[PDB]
Design a protein around this nucleic acid. Sequence first.
DNA 1: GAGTCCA
DNA 2: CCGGTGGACTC
DNA 3: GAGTCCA
DNA 4: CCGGTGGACTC
Lengths: 338, 338
Amino acid sequence: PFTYSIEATRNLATTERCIQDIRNAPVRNRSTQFQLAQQNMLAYTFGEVIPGFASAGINGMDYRDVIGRPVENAVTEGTHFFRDDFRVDSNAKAKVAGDIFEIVSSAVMWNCAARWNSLMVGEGWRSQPRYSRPTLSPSPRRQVAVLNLPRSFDWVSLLVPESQEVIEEFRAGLRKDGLGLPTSTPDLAVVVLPEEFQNDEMWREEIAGLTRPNQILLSGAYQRLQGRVQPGEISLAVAFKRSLRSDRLYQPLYEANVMQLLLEGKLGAPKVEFEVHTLAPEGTNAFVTYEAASLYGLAEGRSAVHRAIRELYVPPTAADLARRFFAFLNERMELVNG
Amino acid sequence: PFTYSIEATRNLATTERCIQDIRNAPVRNRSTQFQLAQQNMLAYTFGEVIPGFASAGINGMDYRDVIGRPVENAVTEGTHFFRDDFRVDSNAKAKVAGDIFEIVSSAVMWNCAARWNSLMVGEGWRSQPRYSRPTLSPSPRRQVAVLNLPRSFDWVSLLVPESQEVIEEFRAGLRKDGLGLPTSTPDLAVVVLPEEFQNDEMWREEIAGLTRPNQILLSGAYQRLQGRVQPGEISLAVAFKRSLRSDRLYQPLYEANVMQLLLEGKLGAPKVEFEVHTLAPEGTNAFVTYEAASLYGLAEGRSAVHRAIRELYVPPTAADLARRFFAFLNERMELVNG
DNA sequence: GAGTCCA
DNA sequence: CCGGTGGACTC
DNA sequence: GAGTCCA
DNA sequence: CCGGTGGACTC
Ligand SMILES: [Mg+2]
Ligand SMILES: [Mg+2]
Ligand SMILES: [Mg+2]
Ligand SMILES: [Mg+2]
Ligand SMILES: [Mg+2]
Ligand SMILES: [Mg+2]
């Protein structure tokens, strides 16, 4: 569970355990002795807890201590089974804390979408835990999907095919001069739910925790929307970076620029909203780096130039994350006609 | 020396040793037990050798083994003196190997610069080791300075003050609207040598190795050119990356786009040549990523249309890096009147 | 299992 | 995916 | 010296 | 500054 439990750990089958001993099943060309079983770790620590939709104490706690609990639980497990032999490289803790920050934040946002969508189709406002009721007029057309995108992905594949064709034709032209314009991905996109899906229940159901089936339901969701999203209906992009270093700030900044050039410049979309979430900004003048104007915006020199990155948000608690997303939906969905 | 010598090591003062034991002198909030003494390492391994300008065997061995030699000499020193107590994090070896790849490459380019410059002023073509004599006609006005840029730096400080003035008025306008356009730095700039320095011998002396004094001379050179370079006199920008990961690609790509926007779009300079060098590209997607067109040029009625990054280069040997730079000088200096 | 690829 | 670094920078 | 920033 | 990583995909 969230608080480590000796008994609950004893109850695990060897394949569900957080530390996997691989001393006698080594990986070709790695010295790894113990693997941190990320998916096991989410199931044990967040099996019946989504932060922000759990107890008041978990919802209000320093979000860093929350995102850090899985690794801390896994090290206690490893120390119990293997004592002085237990060791893990800091680059395993780094990899796993990254994925954990992303998957858990994305799950908080998923439950916000479900509460939001439930209101929009006429079912009122679930009241535990307590959050401000949105004041925007409910409409099934204002529902949204939270898509944790896979490690490797190309966000263009979310678009209806006619929009993919406008992008393809643009690149065709660049190819004749030996140039390209590749697109990669944010960590997460929120999109307006396509009309064909506005009576499906799955988008309105809050999950109770990161059980292996809920992990898969959440991580596979993008496959359902691929091919179905209009350029204007990509409502928020999010990169997640557990901590910052000044040389790791650039991927979101570049991708945001490319998203703006293509969605706004080539497909008529309104302002693309892209933001970055971290738990440890400090040591960097990251807030200053992310004030940069869109390069596209500058190159066209239209009446209003916006930032490529709308904000660097540092969530202090899971409740805060949730409250911020609700306030964002409440404002951004005005723009979608009821 | 370049080949490890127990005897050379035995002769070193405690303060010159490649490994510095800090078990009794810990860094507050660090668990570090032994320090990799980067500057002592370069002095030991490269104190009498700049690769590409040394013996035929060093010039032509796999450059990855050339750049990995200091860390390998350090680990041999550590293992010898401390045996099984010798421990250092992979993150220590990552940091220092990145700085080795940068400093040694820069040094190879410094000697190239010096040999070019000797020819430019009419002193003929040094013959050992033998490189193809350049064909462009000599002129003191076609000498160049090789500038290994400091860790924290803003390339705009290289520019003559009237140019800095143009960038700053443009940014002042952007601030009214709550936007900025920050500049950082590539790792290295080659600039045209300013008129005032064009009969100074320091810019034509090849160094014999990376002794501490020569380390300082190379790392300090950018200071002598601050405030002196015309916008079209920044001839090449280099980003060094020892290995690649797909998330680490974006800092040079973004910066190259900012240099192009500001130098070509606001200051009238020709195409900004910016390239990346790695020893380990781990696949082919990196080459695809760097075929991206420069964003500013994609807006109708701006500067020319071309790649942000000209090329991802994987130097097989020191001699090859030397050769590529001489051939690049032979062509790009056509643009300068002699 | 072994190899490759991802970030 | 990101954290532990050697050296520079600040008082 | 003690502490922070740099990438 | 960058290397060691857990999981995904394929046979
Ligand atoms: Mg990602
Ligand atoms: Mg993702
Ligand atoms: Mg991320
Ligand atoms: Mg640098
Ligand atoms: Mg540099
Ligand atoms: Mg570099």
